[PDB]
Write a protein that binds this ligand. Structure first.
Ligand SMILES: [Mg+2]
Lengths: 267, 98, 178, 99
RNA sequence: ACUGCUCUUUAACAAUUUAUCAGAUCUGUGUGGGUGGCGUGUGGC
DNA sequence: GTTATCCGCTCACAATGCCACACGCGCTGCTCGG
DNA sequence: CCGAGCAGCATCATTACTTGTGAGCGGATAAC
């Protein structure tokens, strides 16, 4: 069989991805509409968001939904939350760079229950449900087999919206570059997390992430054999936007490596 | 894993129910029951006692030894704990490793 | 004016009914109805017409326990412990049990009103799960339940007819797994 | 039925006869043990009890005994011996009169 | 008997912004592939 | 009274290796099931 | 109706002479 909420979510994600892909071939219609410090929100984001919300309301007119745009639309049954990013890495889309994904996760009683991310360009569908695992178009996902820092590929995002910590981040970057093999910088935390679940990157870390972006990936990597944490092993990440994740041994090595360079602001 | 605690059958529908499977059945049964109670309005004393019973069951699974006995049915003898599969002259150490 | 509180005693795996019987019998034995108000074993009647179990099914609020309106005293205590098959007094320290709170009684009785009022078939359905159809018109087809209804009870279910998916109003009686 | 069949079928004492030799069979019927329910077990048997006690003479054989872990705990009844009306071991003697 | 008198010759468009001269593979059926765990007891050395 | 001292009691923890052979290893009124 | 499966059970007192040893703990016993 299959998990029901997962199924309705993947239907929503399919529709949204098809809409985004269809609009991707007319860059004269989607404009750059900035919201904060280089966080564009184009009209296509609004359209995809509305499509997803409509598709959901058919099957759950009572579930409270969360969205970076519409804040928090309450529902008559607010024990279960629907966190959405209709588009991740808006910048990668405006530059028409074909690497982005829509992310839909459903939390139950606070604990994340199901998650999906969908890249329409490569047509890849990372699904994950707790107690059953993670799948990539039908293949199980056990993350990277790395157990050190050598030969390891580290995906990351830069605090290009919280540039005050830049130095700090860059500091640690240098430290990391003394032990790892190579970096990756794609521009969509959801897809980076997904890659962590697929072992295509030996780990990942980031500073300054909104609570509505990792919610679709943290469960992905969790049911993908990997683990997440704050920059110190705690769990305040859900509030600090500071994530470090990967297969367990690599996470341990990274934490022991980063704990010193860390500026005590994030602690 | 399912392999290391196999359920080998017999000439008929008779299966050698290894103690591990039975202890796991007991503990998972307690867990399911307790969760179903937790969602169902949770009478306080009842959930308290059920938590105690579940603690006893997981205890027995990790070790049938302490705090009392959890002997099997139809055979007045204890069930093989996980620790049992390690200690003694029968545990993996003095039986298959060394 | 001795107010008999509400206590709970652990029954056994499959003994609860006859335990309650024997309890009332021993009450009558010692004629201590004044000390033993009522022995409560709440239950539930989930009703499905087919699918193996048919036309009814009997669940319980929670097994292994029995609820009594006893009054606290050592005499009553042994009167409940001098019965065929029970464990000790579920509660605080033994020989000094803990009566359950009145709020517990009120909530449990609201539960009983709710359950006995509406015969509610559990093993319910969730919008979004896939399921086949064992019915003549759509034998062994399979679609996804897009909406679950209880009173009408007619399973708004999207299934593939003439290419385009479409809702269907088939009743519970023909659903497959889940 | 369960109790009696469990005793006669699966008990530490019950065992299918050592039936390969008439002498083996006989000496296995009149066999005395100290193990089993109510009895001590060979691990904690104690080095003492296994010894022969001068009251054994004529009552229980001092020779026939399985060499191994259970020595003395598995004895064989003497030939002329007999069980008492209580469960003690009586031995026949000849009543010596004056001379 | 006792609410009920023409309104006037059939569906009524979405498509849209450099730009161009259009810009070899269609195979197999060679083949590995079609009762034990534990406990107890006995005896032996 | 304090403060530590030591002691009686309790509880955990060990029991040769092999072999060989033999024997045996849910149940029971709930659940289901037609 | 009645056979076949099944779900969680101290099934009261189910007791139980040592085995020998070590460690720890609650409580008697004595110094300041
Ligand atoms: Mg977003």
């Amino acid at each position: 069989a299959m998990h029901p909420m997962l199924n309705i979510a993947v239907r929503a994600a399919r529709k949204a991805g098809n809409l985004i892909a269809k609009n991707y071939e007319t860059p004269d219609a989607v404009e750059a509409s900035q919201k904060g410090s280089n966080d564009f929100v184009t009209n296509v984001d609004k359209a995809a968001e509305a499509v997803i919300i409509d598709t959901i309301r058919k099957s759950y007119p009572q579930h409270t939904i969360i969205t970076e745009e519409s804040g928090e639309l309450e529902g008559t049954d607010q024990d279960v939350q629907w966190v959405i990013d209709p588009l991740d890495g808006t910048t990668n889309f405006i530059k028409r760079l074909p690497h982005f994904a829509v992310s839909i996760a459903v939390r139950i009683k606070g604990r994340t229950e199901v998650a999906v991310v969908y890249d329409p360009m490569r047509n890849e569908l990372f699904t994950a449900t707790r107690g059953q695992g993670a799948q990539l178009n039908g293949y199980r996902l056990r993350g990277s087999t790395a157990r050190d820092l050598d030969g390891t590929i580290l995906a990351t995002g830069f605090p290009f919206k919280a540039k005050q910590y830049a130095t700090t981040y860059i500091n640690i970057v240098g430290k990391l570059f003394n032990e790892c093999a190579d970096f990756r910088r794609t521009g969509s935390a959801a897809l980076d997390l997904a890659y962590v679940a697929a072992g295509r990157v030996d780990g990942f870390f980031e500073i300054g992430l909104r609570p509505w972006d990792f919610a679709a990936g943290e469960l992905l990597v969790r049911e993908a054999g990997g683990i997440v944490s704050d920059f110190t092993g705690g769990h305040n990440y859900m509030l600090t936007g500071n994530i470090v994740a990967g297969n367990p041994r690599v996470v341990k090595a990274m934490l022991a490596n980063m704990r010193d360079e860390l500026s005590d602001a994030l602690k | 894993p399912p392999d290391l605690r196999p359920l080998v059958p017999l000439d008929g529908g008779r299966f050698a129910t290894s103690d591990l499977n039975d202890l796991y059945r007991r503990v998972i049964n307690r867990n399911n029951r307790l969760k179903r109670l937790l969602d169902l309005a949770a009478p306080d004393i009842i959930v308290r006692n059920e938590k105690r019973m579940l603690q006893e069951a997981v205890d027995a699974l990790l070790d049938n030894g302490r705090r009392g006995r959890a002997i099997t049915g139809s055979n007045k003898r204890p069930l093989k704990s996980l620790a049992d599969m390690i200690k003694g002259k029968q545990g993996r150490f003095r039986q298959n490793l060394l | 004016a001795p107010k008999k509180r509400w206590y709970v005693v652990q029954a056994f795996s499959g003994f609860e009914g006859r335990v309650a019987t024997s309890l009332r019998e021993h009450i009558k034995l010692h004629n201590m109805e004044d000390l033993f108000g009522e022995v409560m074993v709440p239950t539930e009647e989930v009703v499905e017409i087919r699918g193996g179990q048919r036309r009814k099914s009997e669940r319980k609020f929670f097994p292994g326990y029995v609820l009594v309106q006893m009054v606290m005293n050592d005499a009553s205590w042994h009167l409940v412990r001098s019965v065929p098959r029970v464990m000790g007094f579920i509660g605080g320290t033994s020989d000094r049990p803990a009566p359950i709170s009145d709020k517990e009684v009120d909530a449990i009785m609201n539960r009983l009103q709710q359950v006995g009022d509406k015969p509610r078939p559990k093993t319910l359905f969730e919008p979004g799960e896939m399921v086949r159809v064992n019915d003549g018109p759509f034998a062994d087809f399979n679609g996804v339940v897009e909406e679950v209804d209880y009173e009408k009870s007619r399973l708004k279910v999207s299934v593939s007819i003439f290419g385009r998916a479409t809702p269907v109003e088939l009743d519970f009686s023909q659903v497959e797994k889940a | 039925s369960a109790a009696v069949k469990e005793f006669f079928g699966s008990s530490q004492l019950s065992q299918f006869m050592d039936q390969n030799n008439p002498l083996s069979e006989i000496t296995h019927k009149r066999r005395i043990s100290a193990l089993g329910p109510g009895g001590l077990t060979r691990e904690r048997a104690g080095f003492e009890v296994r010894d022969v006690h001068p009251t054994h003479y004529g009552r229980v054989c001092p020779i026939e005994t399985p060499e191994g872990p259970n020595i003395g705990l598995i004895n064989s009844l003497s030939v002329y011996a007999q069980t008492n009306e209580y469960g003690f071991l009586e031995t026949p003697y000849r009543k010596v009169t004056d001379g």
